[PDB]
Amino acid sequence: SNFGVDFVIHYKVPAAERDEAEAGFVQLIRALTTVGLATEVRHGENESLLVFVKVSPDLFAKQVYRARLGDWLHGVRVEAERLRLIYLMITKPHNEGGAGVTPTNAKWKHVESIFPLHSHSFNKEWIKKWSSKYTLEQTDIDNIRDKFGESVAFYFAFLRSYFRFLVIPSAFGFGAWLLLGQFSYLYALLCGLWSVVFFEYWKKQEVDLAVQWGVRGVSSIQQSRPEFEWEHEAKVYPPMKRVKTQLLQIPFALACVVALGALIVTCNSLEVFINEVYSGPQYLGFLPTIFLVIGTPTISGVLMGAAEKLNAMENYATVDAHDAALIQKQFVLNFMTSYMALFFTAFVYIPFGHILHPFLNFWRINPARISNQMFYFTVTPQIVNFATEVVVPYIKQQAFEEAEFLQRVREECTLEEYDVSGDYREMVMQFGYVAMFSVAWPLAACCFLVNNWVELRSDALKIAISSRRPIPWRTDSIGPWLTALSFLSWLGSITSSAIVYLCSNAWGLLLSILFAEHFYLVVQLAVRFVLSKLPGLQKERKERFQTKKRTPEEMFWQRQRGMQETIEIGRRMIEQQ
């Protein structure tokens, strides 16, 4: 159990520059005590001064009231909220209610990060409860909300909904595999319909969850990025410079396209070479695909590093815009590196495979090859992700008065900050696989379902012991990933459909693509209309109802009288008629 410590700051103090660190440290303590936070300083590991800060209940209550009033201002209207408020008062510059200690913008370059402490007593209980169940009720998601903020709870709710909705993919995929053979248009139509209904129902459930948790309209609120650099003060930046920096993303995009496409082209060429000339023992015929998948995490990580460097050099005023741009770049890179192989196999080799002949000549036809390639690109990448996610940190950690608490905090500081965008990206990639290439191997979704049941626990374990406690945040939605999902769905509505024509056989292909796209749009509109007729609206309506309960013309008008003589002349005129 913790000692009531709310937040911990590292403040590494290296031997070099040991003349301004003390001044920065004393300024940090003075500023942090100015906002009224109790502090305690202890030693750490490798010349570090770990400072633990906590809350005078009157000031905390005043801050909570101010935050609630601010939320009421924007129309928005527990451990997570308290920790969030403490972090906000720690981070918000001293301009209005806080003291700037951001480790990026101002002079606080000697601190690593500010993180909340992790409670092992709750963590072990949560892990045991989640691993001893089969399905997760809303109480578990509510507990995740109350402990690890709103973003983590939103991600876990999305994962649970996706895993639950994947049960029908597996159902009719197994049905098609057992009976409908391979490359059936009906399976593609059912997959598109499921993607549409899943997207719409997830949006509805997400709005319901936002209403329940009281985080409606949080996305509208804009939070300034401390790392943002301005030039004038109207804190403004020239948009021309921003678009100039953005234009750098284009040549990077084409360069990565060329590099990855060339790599996949050579791998495909050599694999078809060895499949055509080597008798082998089947399994060895697709070994380059497994090798490419195994190497995918390294190049993906270096590409994510390059993308995050580009985003950091791209000045963004607010947190939301920076996050959206980073998500867009990461999604583009992952889509590329995880789908170009299948795209080349399906829409390049299958329709016209005579263009790869020069590669075969340098080294020294079967529609069914895409099915095996999709089987591999479904089974093995999730295994590699599992290995790099859960079991390799296990190996790394196995390789390595109140002193035990200090040792626990010191070991916690080395743990990297847990991020949610990575898990969202993995889930979006899996959904794209399902929506775009399940026709080649209908069983694939089923496998993903199994993986999801592990992931919904495994990622939880990733939060527990392999990472430090995430900083609570409020997000109205899951972010731009939402839109990304829709895009993938639309792409599936073409992609899989075209595959059905390509692996079973010009005019027919275009007709099938057009029909599938129009059917996708029709069912999208139909499901949107159906869900428009159906939660949180009743609670909002009840809240709204409860708040609710909380001279010619003078002679003409002075002709006879008021009411009585009027009806007198009424009967008079009736009789005259």
Contacts with a copy of itself by CB under 8 A lie at 3-4, 13, 18, 21-22, 25-26, 29-30, 33, 38-43, 47, 49, 54, 73, 401-402, 506-507, 510-511, 513-514, 544, 548, 552-553, 556-557, 559, 562-563, 566-567, 569-571, 573-574, 576-577
What one-letter code names the amino acid at 204?
A: K
Coil/strand/helix, residue 42: strand
Instruction: From the list Ca ion, a copy of itself, none, pick the one residue 389 interacts with, judged by a Cβ distance below 5 to 8 Å according to partner type.
Output: Ca ion
Question: Which residue, among 268, 277, 275, has the nearest Cα to 350 in the 3D structure?
Answer: 268
The CA distance from 336 to 166, in Å, is: 24
Task: Confirm whether residue 419 is marked as ligand binding.
Answer: no
Instruction: From the list Ca ion, a copy of itself, none, pick the one residue 549 interacts with, judged by a Cβ distance below 5 to 8 Å according to partner type.
Output: none
Contacts of 470 (CB under 8 A, 6+ apart): 148, 149, 151, 152, 417, 418, 419, 420, 463
Task: Confirm whether residue 423 is marked as ligand binding.
Answer: yes
Instruction: From the list a copy of itself, Ca ion, none, pick the one residue 459 interacts with, judged by a Cβ distance below 5 to 8 Å according to partner type.
Output: Ca ion
CB of 213 to a copy of itself, least distance (A): 22
- Which one, 206 or 423, has the nearer CB to Ca ion? 423
The CA distance from 577 to 573, in Å, is: 6
CB of 462 to Ca ion, least distance (A): 7
The CA distance from 132 to 542, in Å, is: 38
The CA distance from 500 to 368, in Å, is: 12
What one-letter code names the amino acid at 391?
A: V
Task: Confirm whether residue 385 is marked as ligand binding.
Answer: yes
How would you label 277-301 residue by residue, b for 16+ Cβ within 10 Å and e otherwise?
eeeeeeeebbbbbbebbeebbebbe
Instruction: From the list a copy of itself, Ca ion, none, pick the one residue 385 interacts with, judged by a Cβ distance below 5 to 8 Å according to partner type.
Output: Ca ion
- Which one, 175 or 422, has the nearer CB to Ca ion? 422
Contacts of 382 (CB under 8 A, 6+ apart): 430, 447, 448, 451
Instruction: From the list Ca ion, a copy of itself, none, pick the one residue 30 interacts with, judged by a Cβ distance below 5 to 8 Å according to partner type.
Output: a copy of itself
What is the layout of strands, in order, in the sheet containing 7-9? 38-43, 49-54, 7-9, 114-116
Instruction: From the list a copy of itself, Ca ion, none, pick the one residue 423 interacts with, judged by a Cβ distance below 5 to 8 Å according to partner type.
Output: Ca ion
Instruction: From the list Ca ion, a copy of itself, none, pick the one residue 150 interacts with, judged by a Cβ distance below 5 to 8 Å according to partner type.
Output: none
Q: Is 6 in the site for Ca ion (CB under 5 A)?
A: no
Question: Which residue, among 270, 330, 263, has the nearest Cα to 295 in the 3D structure?
Answer: 263
SS3 labels along 170-185: HHHHHHHHHCCCCCCH
Note the helical H segments in 231-318. 239-246, 249-277, 287-313
The CA distance from 208 to 202, in Å, is: 10
CB of 39 to a copy of itself, least distance (A): 6
SS3 labels along 215-239: CCCCCCCCCECCCCCCCECCCECCH
Give the x-and-dash track for 446-485 against Ca ion (CB under 5 A): ---------x---x--------------------------
CB of 361 to a copy of itself, least distance (A): 32
- Which one, 12 or 462, has the nearer CB to a copy of itself? 12
- Which one, 181 or 570, has the nearer CB to a copy of itself? 570
CB of 200 to Ca ion, least distance (A): 25
Task: Confirm whether residue 206 is marked as ligand binding.
Answer: no
Q: Is 150 in the site for Ca ion (CB under 5 A)?
A: no
How many residues in the shown chain lie near Ca ion by CB under 5 A? 6
Task: Confirm whether residue 389 is marked as ligand binding.
Answer: yes
- Which one, 50 or 461, has the nearer CB to Ca ion? 461
Q: Is 200 in the site for Ca ion (CB under 5 A)?
A: no
Task: Confirm whether residue 459 is marked as ligand binding.
Answer: yes
The CA distance from 384 to 264, in Å, is: 18
CB of 567 to a copy of itself, least distance (A): 5
Annotated binding site for Ca(2+): 385, 389, 423, 426, 455, 459
Binding residue ranges: 385, 389, 423, 426, 455, 459
Q: Which residues bind Ca ion (CB under 5 A)?
A: 385, 389, 423, 426, 455, 459
